[PDB]
């Protein structure tokens, strides 16, 4: 659970040569494709 | 669209919104104008 709601933590790395910023951008775009009632957020190192 | 009543709005605000707002940056206290849904067992003394 994340911020008092049911969550599921996913860890991942930016592919060689690609920066963290543009890597996260795709995950955000892919997350918008997901079914209704399913959102997201960034935690830990991604929050900073 | 008048699908949800007053009690329905008050419940959704309490369940989903209230907790998220109460933990937001700078928010001291959160006063809900209404009440969250509970399982109401409306007893009947005749049938008892």
UniProtKB/Swiss-Prot annotation, chain A:
Induction: Positively regulated by MarA, Rob and SoxS transcriptional regulators (at protein level). Disruption phenotype: Loss of susceptibility to contact-dependent growth inhibition (CDI); inhibiting cells still contact the target. It is found in: Cell inner membrane. Homotrimer, with large domains that extend into the periplasm, interacts with AcrA and TolC. AcrA may be required to stably link this protein and TolC. Interacts with AcrZ. Part of the AcrA-AcrB-AcrZ-TolC efflux pump. AcrA-AcrB-AcrZ-TolC is a drug efflux protein complex with broad substrate specificity that uses the proton motive force to export substrates. (Microbial infection) Involved in contact-dependent growth inhibition (CDI), acts downstream of BamA, the receptor for CDI. Its role in CDI is independent of the AcrA-AcrB-TolC efflux pump complex. Belongs to the resistance-nodulation-cell division (RND) (TC 2.A.6) family. This is Multidrug efflux pump subunit AcrB.
């Amino acid at each position: 659970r994340y911020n008092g709601l049911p969550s599921m933590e996913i860890l991942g790395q930016a592919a060689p040569g690609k920066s963290t910023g543009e890597a996260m951008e795709l995950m955000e775009q892919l997350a918008s494709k997901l079914p209704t009632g399913v959102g997201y957020d960034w935690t830990g190192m991604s929050y900073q | 669209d008048g699908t949800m009543t007053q009690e329905d709005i008050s419940d959704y605000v309490a369940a989903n919104m209230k907790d998220a707002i109460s933990r937001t940056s700078g928010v001291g206290d959160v006063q809900l104008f209404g009440s969250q849904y509970a399982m109401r067992i409306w007893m009947n003394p005749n049938e008892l």
